[PDB]
Amino acid sequence: AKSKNHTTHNQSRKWHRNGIKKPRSQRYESLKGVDPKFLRNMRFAKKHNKKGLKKMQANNA
Amino acid sequence: VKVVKNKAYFKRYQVKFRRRREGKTDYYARKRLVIQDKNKYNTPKYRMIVRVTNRDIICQIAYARIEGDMIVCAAYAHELPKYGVKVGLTNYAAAYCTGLLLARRLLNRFGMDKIYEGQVEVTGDEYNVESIDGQPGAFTCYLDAGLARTTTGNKVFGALKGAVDGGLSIPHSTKRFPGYDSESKEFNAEVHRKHIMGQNVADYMRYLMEEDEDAYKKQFSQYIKNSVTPDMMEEMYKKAHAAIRENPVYEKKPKKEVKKKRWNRPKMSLAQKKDRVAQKKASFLRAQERAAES
Amino acid sequence: RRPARCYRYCKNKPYPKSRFCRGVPDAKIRIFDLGRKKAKVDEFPLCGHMVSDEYEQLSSEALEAARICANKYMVKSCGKDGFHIRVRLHPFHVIRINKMLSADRLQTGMRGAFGKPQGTVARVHIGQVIMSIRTKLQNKEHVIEALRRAKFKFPGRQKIHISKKWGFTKFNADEFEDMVAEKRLIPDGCGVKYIPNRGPLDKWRALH
Amino acid sequence: ENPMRELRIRKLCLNICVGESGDRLTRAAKVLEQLTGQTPVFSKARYTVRSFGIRRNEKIAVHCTVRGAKAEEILEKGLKVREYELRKNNFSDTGNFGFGIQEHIDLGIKYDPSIGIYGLDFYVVLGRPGFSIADKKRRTGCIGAKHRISKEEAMRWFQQKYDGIILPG
Amino acid sequence: TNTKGKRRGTRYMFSRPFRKHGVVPLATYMRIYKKGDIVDIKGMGTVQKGMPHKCYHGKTGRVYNVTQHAVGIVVNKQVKGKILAKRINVRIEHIKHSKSRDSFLKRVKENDQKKKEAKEKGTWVQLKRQPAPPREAHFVRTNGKEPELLEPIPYEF
RNA sequence: GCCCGGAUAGCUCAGUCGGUAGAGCAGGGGAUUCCGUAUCCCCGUGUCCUUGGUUCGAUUCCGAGUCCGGGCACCA
RNA sequence: UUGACUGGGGCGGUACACCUGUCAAACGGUAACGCAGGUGUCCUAAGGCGAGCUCAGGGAGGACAGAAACCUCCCGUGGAGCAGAAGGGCAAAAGCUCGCUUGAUCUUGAUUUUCAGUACGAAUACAGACCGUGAAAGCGGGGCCUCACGAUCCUUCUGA
RNA sequence: CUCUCGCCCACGCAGUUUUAUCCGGUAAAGCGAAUGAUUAGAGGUCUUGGGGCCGAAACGAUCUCAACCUAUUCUCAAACUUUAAAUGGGUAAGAAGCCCGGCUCGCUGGCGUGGAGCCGGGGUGGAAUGCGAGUGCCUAGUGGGCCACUUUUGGUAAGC
RNA sequence: GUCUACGGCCAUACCACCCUGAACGCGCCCGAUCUCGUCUGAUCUCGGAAGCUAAGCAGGGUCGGGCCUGGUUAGUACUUGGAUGGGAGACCGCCUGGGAAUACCGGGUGCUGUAGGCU
Numbered sequence A: 001a002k003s004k005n006h007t008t009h010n011q012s013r014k015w016h017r018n019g020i021k022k023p024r025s026q027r028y029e030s031l032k033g034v035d036p037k038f039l040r041n042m043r044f045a046k047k048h049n050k051k052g053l054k055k056m057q058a059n060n061a
Numbered sequence B: 001v002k003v004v005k006n007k008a009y010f011k012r013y014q015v016k017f018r019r020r021r022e023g024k025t026d027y028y029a030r031k032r033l034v035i036q037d038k039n040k041y042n043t044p045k046y047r048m049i050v051r052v053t054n055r056d057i058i059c060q061i062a063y064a065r066i067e068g069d070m071i072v073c074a075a076y077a078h079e080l081p082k083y084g085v086k087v088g089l090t091n092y093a094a095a096y097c098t099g100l101l102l103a104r105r106l107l108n109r110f111g112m113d114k115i116y117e118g119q120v121e122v123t124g125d126e127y128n129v130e131s132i133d134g135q136p137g138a139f140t141c142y143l144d145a146g147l148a149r150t151t152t153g154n155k156v157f158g159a160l161k162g163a164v165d166g167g168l169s170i171p172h173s174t175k176r177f178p179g180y181d182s183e184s185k186e187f188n189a190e191v192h193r194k195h196i197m198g199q200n201v202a203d204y205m206r207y208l209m210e211e212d213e214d215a216y217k218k219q220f221s222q223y224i225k226n227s228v229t230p231d232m233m234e235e236m237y238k239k240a241h242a243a244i245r246e247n248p249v250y251e252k253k254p255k256k257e258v259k260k261k262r263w264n265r266p267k268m269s270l271a272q273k274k275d276r277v278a279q280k281k282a283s284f285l286r287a288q289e290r291a292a293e294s
Numbered sequence C: 001r002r003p004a005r006c007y008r009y010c011k012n013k014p015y016p017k018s019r020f021c022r023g024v025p026d027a028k029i030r031i032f033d034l035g036r037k038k039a040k041v042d043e044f045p046l047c048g049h050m051v052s053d054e055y056e057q058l059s060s061e062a063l064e065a066a067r068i069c070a071n072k073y074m075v076k077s078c079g080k081d082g083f084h085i086r087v088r089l090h091p092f093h094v095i096r097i098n099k100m101l102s103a104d105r106l107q108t109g110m111r112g113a114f115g116k117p118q119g120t121v122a123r124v125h126i127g128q129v130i131m132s133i134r135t136k137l138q139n140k141e142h143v144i145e146a147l148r149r150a151k152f153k154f155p156g157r158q159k160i161h162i163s164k165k166w167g168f169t170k171f172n173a174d175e176f177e178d179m180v181a182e183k184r185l186i187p188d189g190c191g192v193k194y195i196p197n198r199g200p201l202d203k204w205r206a207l208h
Numbered sequence D: 001e002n003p004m005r006e007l008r009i010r011k012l013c014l015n016i017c018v019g020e021s022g023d024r025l026t027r028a029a030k031v032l033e034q035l036t037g038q039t040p041v042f043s044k045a046r047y048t049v050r051s052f053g054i055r056r057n058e059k060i061a062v063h064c065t066v067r068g069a070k071a072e073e074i075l076e077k078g079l080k081v082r083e084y085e086l087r088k089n090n091f092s093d094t095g096n097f098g099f100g101i102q103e104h105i106d107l108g109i110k111y112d113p114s115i116g117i118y119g120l121d122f123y124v125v126l127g128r129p130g131f132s133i134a135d136k137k138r139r140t141g142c143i144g145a146k147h148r149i150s151k152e153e154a155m156r157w158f159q160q161k162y163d164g165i166i167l168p169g
Numbered sequence E: 001t002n003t004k005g006k007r008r009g010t011r012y013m014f015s016r017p018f019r020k021h022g023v024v025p026l027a028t029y030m031r032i033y034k035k036g037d038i039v040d041i042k043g044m045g046t047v048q049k050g051m052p053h054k055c056y057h058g059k060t061g062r063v064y065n066v067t068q069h070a071v072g073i074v075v076n077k078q079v080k081g082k083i084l085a086k087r088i089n090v091r092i093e094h095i096k097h098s099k100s101r102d103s104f105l106k107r108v109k110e111n112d113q114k115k116k117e118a119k120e121k122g123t124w125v126q127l128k129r130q131p132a133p134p135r136e137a138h139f140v141r142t143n144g145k146e147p148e149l150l151e152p153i154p155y156e157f
Numbered sequence F: 001g002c003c004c005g006g007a008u009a010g011c012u013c014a015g016u017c018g019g020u021a022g023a024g025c026a027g028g029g030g031a032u033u034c035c036g037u038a039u040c041c042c043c044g045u046g047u048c049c050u051u052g053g054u055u056c057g058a059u060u061c062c063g064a065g066u067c068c069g070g071g072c073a074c075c076a
Numbered sequence G: 001u002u003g004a005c006u007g008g009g010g011c012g013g014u015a016c017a018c019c020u021g022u023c024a025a026a027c028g029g030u031a032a033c034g035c036a037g038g039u040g041u042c043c044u045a046a047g048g049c050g051a052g053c054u055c056a057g058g059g060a061g062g063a064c065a066g067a068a069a070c071c072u073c074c075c076g077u078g079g080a081g082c083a084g085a086a087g088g089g090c091a092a093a094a095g096c097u098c099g100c101u102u103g104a105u106c107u108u109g110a111u112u113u114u115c116a117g118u119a120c121g122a123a124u125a126c127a128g129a130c131c132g133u134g135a136a137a138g139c140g141g142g143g144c145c146u147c148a149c150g151a152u153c154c155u156u157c158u159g160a
Numbered sequence H: 001c002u003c004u005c006g007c008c009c010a011c012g013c014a015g016u017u018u019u020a021u022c023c024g025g026u027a028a029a030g031c032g033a034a035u036g037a038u039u040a041g042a043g044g045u046c047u048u049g050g051g052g053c054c055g056a057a058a059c060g061a062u063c064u065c066a067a068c069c070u071a072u073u074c075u076c077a078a079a080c081u082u083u084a085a086a087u088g089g090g091u092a093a094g095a096a097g098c099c100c101g102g103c104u105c106g107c108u109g110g111c112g113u114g115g116a117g118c119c120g121g122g123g124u125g126g127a128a129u130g131c132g133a134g135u136g137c138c139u140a141g142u143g144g145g146c147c148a149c150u151u152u153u154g155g156u157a158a159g160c
Numbered sequence I: 001g002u003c004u005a006c007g008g009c010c011a012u013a014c015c016a017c018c019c020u021g022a023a024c025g026c027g028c029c030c031g032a033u034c035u036c037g038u039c040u041g042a043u044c045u046c047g048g049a050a051g052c053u054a055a056g057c058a059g060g061g062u063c064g065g066g067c068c069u070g071g072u073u074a075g076u077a078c079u080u081g082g083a084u085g086g087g088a089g090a091c092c093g094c095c096u097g098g099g100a101a102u103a104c105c106g107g108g109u110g111c112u113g114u115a116g117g118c119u
């Protein structure tokens, strides 16, 4: 009672029936998987730029 | 008649490198000593290229670019008679005195002279310069002997300590300095401050006066030629360590002096060698036609 | 041995004798030059090919029977050692036999179907030469009749073509004698070795 | 006319190849140490053949190399038992030579039945000033065809010093 | 059936072109990869330590992460009915700078400066590029001679 | 009519360790004995199936062909 | 209760989990009881680091020595080796010898491969410890790379 | 459901091309290029294998088959390859872009170094053609296919 | 006009042989007391400076071998799409677009980066 093993016939036309899509690259990709030592510095750079900066910033700006 | 030598071994042949065929480097140790860990992205990794030759020693600090290595500052030993050491420019004391010249000249260029004076007196012990906070940091630098067998007492490690006593932050161990007992584990620093001032070649002068003055003229002829006497030798280097620490700037000779340009042959053209063949073919057919009919 | 209808039109990829086949018997052709092999170049000027018209497989056994049919005719009329037959294509393609019933359903059917080796055949392209004899120019009408008798032992269609070269070399017969004359060609037995004018000069000094 | 381009003895190397180790190979190292004055080093095999009594990594032979002034003083011993004569085909294509002897007591060694009798193989390589660049570490180079030494140029040397005979048979 | 193993179809493509074997040139390590640089993936066969897969060899991605010896590259993989923005850690010998945007960066550069050159000079230079137009109505010259009559050669075997 | 190993003196058979072709019958010649029986000994006799490949080395190993005998054997 | 696959089934075999080359049609993917094979291990070094050295083979020579012993020179783009099956790779080496060792350790995530874009396995780049080796930059969290293995529930030992 | 067009420029998208830029080892071709196969003669000669003689004998002297070597020559390769298409694959073709000023940092470090981050400002017209897109939920049927160009695997062939 | 030190591209730089080499250098060379390492101061390490361009090295030469690059081969071989094209078939021709490779022939034969020295 043997059957048929494997085809990819008809399979490509049903992929494109709904239109294979680009992944929608959207602005500000996340930082998932970036190495931790670079990442641990960079948010220390973020938690001190709002605090101890903006009186000696606007007068330069 | 014998065997099948090459004839198409050249068809497949793959030459190594221009610098491996000449034999200078190895590129296995270069690859691990030169390329920057690239999340620092531009920061140059600085070397200490030390090469001894016949009759000279060459000390350089270089870093790598992609079009070739860039050299910051270099110090030689043919230069070193200008500080007093006029003869014997390959021994261990000249090697250390080149490394101090190479260390003081660099920190003059970067402006770190009055900070980082290193070890002014020479004790031979493991000095290790640190970073004084608030000022520029110590110049970090990595040694390469290149292709030399780094056994203990190699004079590439003399120039390693003239650097370290000059204020270059170089990671090293004292295990290869002359004065490290092999079967023991101690480091006799007094042997090294003897070895660094050249009393061993003063005692090899002293071993040669009282044994055989004929061999003491065969070797060591140019120490006697000007005036070098083995009790004076330990002070002569110490008077040169004072001199290199107060003026390392390397003035240059103005190098023009001539305008002449012809010493070796130019490559002859196609037409100049194509007619050389028809000239050779002419002389062959005139000796077969004429000198075999006669 | 199955008919040559069955092992005809070039269907499979070339499946040559190597460390992967290891069990294919010998070709019935084992010798390939049968005239006078010892001849020089100027002893037999003209040559004659038989040319394939179609792309098929000739067995090694059919090449055995072909050259025998040509060797026999030319010793009758051109005489022995007055010709040089050369069969030019070699059998390297191994055909297979799915040797069933080794009257029963009992062995398998098509279950283990890949065959054992059965013989060697030769894959021939269109316009590729099969046989080539070379003789005197007095023997031109015996070239064709030798190869006309040899073409009835091949399947399909062959055309017989008197070539324009000199012998079994690659240079043309009209200008060979004009150009072997001075230096440009030297004879070494059954072929001609071209010399350019771009080697080292000492071999030119060895010449002349 | 050719300054500092002269044939000098580069080294002299010796061996005895015994078919087995143990007692017999050990006191043969005593012999070769008495000729030279420096300790032998033990060579060994890499093909068990099962027809010579050999085995892989089994210490089959002893050898040593002698350089400088002591090489010629063992060589001149070897040329008097062979009586200053060689054959033409003892001169290799690279020029260097060898001759070999039997019964080592024909050379200066006193006899002992507890030691026995061994045969040497003296092998001389030749040299010029400049051959070190093929064995130098740093800038290793080839030697140049005008500087390498030939078969016919080493036999014209063995005639010159040591007044030898070529014996061209 | 078909042995789902890593490094499977690569008898030729993780291999050297020919007569460039041996140890790698050192300028490959002295290359500067910042975030957002467009790099393409060509895995060699000498360094075993970080080669990507046989699915990315010949694709082109974008750097999102730079570490000591390797670079995180976000590439697009065609899986069956959809594509996936996939990120892979690749060591530095297996990639290079793609020249694919560097012929766009030159135009943007010599485009903006030529744009303000029309402000000072007052013109309508039309810096937008066009495809190949049909050929202009030009003029040939058969000076003196007359055209060459060629005719098809006969058949000879 | 498919597979398993065998092809050797006149026969037959073992071994053809990658290095000789040797037991044993039959005939031949001796010796022994009063003469024979047996017996003993020596001699004779190998394309070591055919060709191709693998090392100063193949009958031997490898794998083609020919040949000879020995065999896988379903429900219907 | 008496497996499945299967050119009916049985008998056989494993195409039932896995690796190499081909098939495969120059990205990737792709079938048959398709072809040629391999796996259920081995290793305290065959792991890790450093240093030194070059391999197969061949030529000309060297007492016994001969096709095969050892020594010596010259040539030697890999024609050898790297545990094995193949492919890739590899020459001051990833090969050989020697010297020190245990990173074949502890810990959180990310990613890749198979893929449903799940797991197991295997692998990558890190980060936080603690260590090795080395003059040093470095390199090292097993084997030069691609295979070498296994849930719930149960038991066992370890850990505060 | 979120939006876009209602009335000198589309936000965007694409089973398409152009412009560039990468990727690949198939068809062909190649083997007087490596690996694996394979036919023929010519030259050369250390030689051994075997003959021919001058000869008690002498690598004293003279030929041939073979083996080797050199330059040629015939024929091939799914599990060979220097070379190498066509068709094909990935990316790019701008405002999320370009330029300038400043400031954070515990990361990096001769260094106002390196690199990220944030804030402020300055200039929109950026290949062709076509089209309005974006998103989220619940979800049935299906999980025996079959044929034809062309490419292909097993088979003698098959409405296999 | 060249060199040395360090390099980038890795034969247009390699291989074999032959000529030439001013000055600096690089070397060969001379030694084994210390430093170190060997069976052997040959290598490695260390002290030198009596010699020498003989080697290496650097330039140059070869109707050179390779390598590089262009012609021929060739619009050939293959190939994208197309036809109720031919032909018993095998396969061949055309439309539409692309488009190789060897023999054979020609030309080339290292270029430069940082630092320093000779002329």
Ligand SMILES: [Mg+2]
Pocket: I032
């Ligand atoms: Mg000593």
Ligand SMILES: [Mg+2]
Pocket: none
């Ligand atoms: Mg010692």
Ligand SMILES: [Mg+2]
Pocket: none
């Ligand atoms: Mg010496």
Ligand SMILES: [Mg+2]
Pocket: I053, I057
């Ligand atoms: Mg010179």
Ligand SMILES: [Mg+2]
Pocket: none
């Ligand atoms: Mg010279």
Ligand SMILES: [Mg+2]
Pocket: none
């Ligand atoms: Mg030249």
Ligand SMILES: [Mg+2]
Pocket: I064
């Ligand atoms: Mg040339």
Ligand SMILES: [Mg+2]
Pocket: I081
């Ligand atoms: Mg078509």
Ligand SMILES: [Mg+2]
Pocket: none
């Ligand atoms: Mg149609």
